[PDB]
Design an enzyme around this catalytic site. Structure first.
Site, PDB file in Angstrom:
ATOM      1  N   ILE E  38      50.976  34.970  84.507  1.00 58.33           N
ATOM      2  CA  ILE E  38      49.953  36.688  84.408  1.00 58.33           C
ATOM      3  C   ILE E  38      50.497  37.039  83.231  1.00 58.33           C
ATOM      4  CG2 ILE E  38      49.118  38.699  85.357  1.00 58.33           C
ATOM      5  CD1 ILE E  38      49.305  37.164  88.386  1.00 58.33           C
ATOM      6  N   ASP E  39      49.630  37.321  82.574  1.00 57.92           N
ATOM      7  CA  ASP E  39      49.858  37.492  81.141  1.00 57.92           C
ATOM      8  C   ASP E  39      49.626  39.388  81.303  1.00 57.92           C
ATOM      9  OD1 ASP E  39      47.072  36.808  81.400  1.00 57.92           O
ATOM     10  OD2 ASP E  39      46.948  37.158  79.344  1.00 57.92           O
ATOM     11  N   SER E  40      50.067  40.201  79.884  1.00 57.46           N
ATOM     12  CA  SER E  40      49.640  41.781  80.118  1.00 57.46           C
ATOM     13  C   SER E  40      48.989  41.805  80.499  1.00 57.46           C
ATOM     14  CB  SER E  40      50.663  42.347  79.178  1.00 57.46           C
ATOM     15  N   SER E  42      46.208  40.747  82.624  1.00 55.27           N
ATOM     16  CA  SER E  42      45.325  40.489  83.257  1.00 55.27           C
ATOM     17  C   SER E  42      46.476  41.126  84.400  1.00 55.27           C
ATOM     18  CB  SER E  42      46.141  38.632  83.870  1.00 55.27           C
ATOM     19  OG  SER E  42      45.662  37.993  83.097  1.00 55.27           O
TER      20      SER E  42
END
Ligand SMILES: CC(C)(COP(=O)(O)O)[C@@H](O)C(=O)NCCC(=O)NCCS
Ligand SMILES: CC(C)(COP(=O)(O)O)[C@@H](O)C(=O)NCCC(=O)NCCS
Lengths: 81, 242, 78, 183, 81
Positions: E38-40, E42
């Site tokens: 999960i990227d920032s 998201s």
């Protein structure tokens, strides 16, 4: 906290100033719309006075929900607690 | 002026062919489905034919006058509007299908969610062009009624035959089913950025929009029509000789 | 049962008649009269309005000199 | 000149009335109209550059009203579609509603806008250059509108205004907080 | 307050909506960067959803610090207490 009697007394004084309804009329089972005949603008005035005197902030969305004096007292007590 | 009208009437077929080719290419890129593209093309052809037919029929009986600009605008606007309405309807239907609803409920959700928007868009387009009827130059004024009538016909066709075509075809096999199931990470990111930090994004967008005003001081126009025509028209040959 | 609205239900139930009617009407319209190009050619409109002072000046010159009554001219070059 | 003024005024008033009737809100209609007008100015700038400076043929004297009358309507339609979806998704909070509406409509609206723009720009193959200029101006306008005004400007303004975006209707900024679910 | 199970269930539902990762995958020992990928952005979407549903405000600076699901649960419980 504050007892229900104290909150009712303060709100009754404020309502007396805003609308002119005598404090003896204000009882926790009264409905603002029907029993006391208080429109929404008068209610936001009451909220402004309450925030500026006792430091209790009531947003307009909540003001829509509140129906009777007991409801407002319960809301104030919940915030205090 | 005569050569201008002649060239405007001559290039119409080429314009129509190129527009159809480009639309087919883009629909293939978007939907990845040949049958879906054929359905959308059928809808577009029906709408365009209705628009041009009604305009020609009314013009032939001297209800209003016509110009080359009016005809070109009618054709292109009809094509574009029909394609847009087809895209809206099919997109909503496929979104409902991808959510999980069956075909009946997907169709009803599509209609409920996009019926009013298509009508409103069509009414805005029709009413905007109808404001040209209040101008003074005949070239602008003679575009109001034809464009309005064409847009109304296209909207009626899209709102009545469109749902009918969608209802009929979707029943006959897996025709309008979403070909590629995939969410939208890019749109998630754009929405989050626009919600979390609206001030910065608004500032950037407004700065970008106001850049175009730098071209205003140097704007000028000319009235010599031989500059807007090919060099082989008879008028330009005579002008060169003179 | 869900109360389906009347309009989409009507469109779905009688889809084939609606499509056939639309196709028939469109074909009739495109067949009865000529193409849009010919109609536009034979129904062209003058560029300048009759209120235009220049057009009035040219027509005034034509009628006063008793020579013509138009407002458009071309030049033949030899 | 006079016809351009008349067309702009009448089209703006009619579009504003239609948007106000449909969305039942005044501020939303005003936002739609203002953003479309800004996009219109940007479109004029881009078209003037591309033709006059690059190609060398200045714009014809009748390009501007024809381009404006279509740019206003189509930009307003796309913004209306986005806002109409937002109104349906808004019961879950303004911000979550906007995010869901964008995720729902973005691809569809982008495809439709690109199709419209590339249909208008294809008129440039005409022998008559006035028609090509009109087509390219409308195409650039719709391109800029779709890629900037709808994607960034409109949701940003909607977020900033908050509950005032839907005036005179009454809308909660955020719903009543809920208890955490029991697994 | 709220038990760890309830917070985990709510966050799992939100993560399922945002990214599509099934709720069964979300366990308190999972790392957002590596385990769940999960990227920032998201993560800030998750924060927005959480604030708009349960009224828990998570600033971005804190979002940088949070690493695993257990960390977020602990942060939410600390705010609640
Ligand atoms: C003002 C009020 C509380 C009155 O409510 P009522 O109609 O229940 O008396 C309600 O209309 C409201 O919240 N309006 C939204 C903001 C607003 O009206 N501002 C004043 C307009 S200048
Ligand atoms: C947006 C984000 C949280 C993403 O972080 P990531 O690079 O860890 O995904 C980080 O870049 C950040 O804090 N940026 C500062 C503000 C910002 O980027 N605003 C959007 C630019 S318009």
């Amino acid at each position: 906290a504050a007892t229900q009697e104290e909150i009712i007394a303060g709100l009754a004084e404020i309502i007396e100033e805003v609308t002119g309804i005598e404090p003896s009329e204000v009882t926790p089972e009264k409905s603002f719309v029907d029993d006391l005949d208080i429109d929404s603008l008068s209610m936001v005035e009451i909220a402004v006075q309450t925030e500026d005197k006792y430091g209790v902030k009531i947003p307009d969305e909540d003001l829509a929900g509140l129906r009777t004096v007991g409801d407002v007292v319960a809301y104030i007590q919940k915030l205090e607690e | 002026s005569a050569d201008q009208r002649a060239e405007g009437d001559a290039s119409m077929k080429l314009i129509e062919g190129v527009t159809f080719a480009v639309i087919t290419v883009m629909l293939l890129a978007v939907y990845r489905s040949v049958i879906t593209t054929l359905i959308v093309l059928a809808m577009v052809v029906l709408g365009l034919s209705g628009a041009r037919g009604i305009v020609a029929f009314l013009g032939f009986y001297n209800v209003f006058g016509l110009t080359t600009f009016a005809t070109n605008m009618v054709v292109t606007l009809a094509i574009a509007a029909a394609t847009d309405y087809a895209i809206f309807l099919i997109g909503r239907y496929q979104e409902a299908r991808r959510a999980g609803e069956d075909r009946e409920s997907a169709y009803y959700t599509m209609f409920h969610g996009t019926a009013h928007v298509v009508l409103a868009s069509g009414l805005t387009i029709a009413g905007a062009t109808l404001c040209l009827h209040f101008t003074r130059l005949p070239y602008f004024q003679t575009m109001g009624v034809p464009l309005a009538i064409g847009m109304l016909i296209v909207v009626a066709a899209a709102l009545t035959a469109g749902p009918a075509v969608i209802s009929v075809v979707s029943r006959f096999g897996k025709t309008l089913e979403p070909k590629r199931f995939s969410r939208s990470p890019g749109w998630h990111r754009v929405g989050t950025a626009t919600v979390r930090w609206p001030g910065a994004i608004l500032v950037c967008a407004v700065v970008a929009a106001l850049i175009g005003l730098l071209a205003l001081p140097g704007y000028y126009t000319t009235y010599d029509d031989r500059r807007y025509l090919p060099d082989d028209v008879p008028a330009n040959v005579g002008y060169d000789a003179a | 049962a869900p109360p389906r609205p009347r309009l989409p239900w009507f469109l779905r139930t009688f889809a084939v008649p609606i499509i056939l009617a639309w196709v028939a009407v469109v074909a009739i319209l495109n067949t009865v009269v000529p193409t849009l190009d010919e109609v536009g050619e034979m129904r062209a409109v003058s560029m300048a309005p009759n209120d235009a002072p220049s057009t009035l000046a040219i027509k005034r010159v034509g009628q006063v000199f008793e020579e013509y009554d138009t407002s458009s001219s071309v030049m033949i070059v030899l | 000149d006079y016809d351009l003024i008349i067309v702009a005024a009448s089209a703006l008033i009619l579009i504003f009335i239609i948007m106000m009737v449909l969305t039942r809100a005044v501020v939303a209609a005003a936002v739609i109209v203002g953003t479309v007008v800004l996009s219109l100015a940007s479109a004029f700038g881009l078209s003037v550059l591309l033709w006059q400076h690059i190609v060398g043929i200045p714009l014809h004297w009748m390009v501007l009203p024809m381009s404006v009358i279509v740019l206003l309507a189509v930009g307003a339609d796309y913004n209306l579609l986005l806002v109409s979806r937002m109104k349906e998704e808004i019961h879950a909070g303004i911000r979550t509603g906007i995010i869901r509406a964008m995720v729902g409509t973005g691809a569809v609206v982008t495809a439709a806008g690109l199709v419209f723009a590339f249909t208008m720009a294809s008129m440039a193959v005409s022998s008559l250059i006035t028609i090509g200029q009109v087509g390219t101006t409308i195409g650039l306008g719709l391109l800029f509108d779709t890629l900037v005004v709808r994607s960034l400007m409109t949701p940003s303004i909607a977020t900033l205004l908050g509950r005032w975006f839907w005036w005179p209707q009454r809308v909660r900024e955020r719903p009543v907080p809920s208890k955490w679910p029991t697994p």
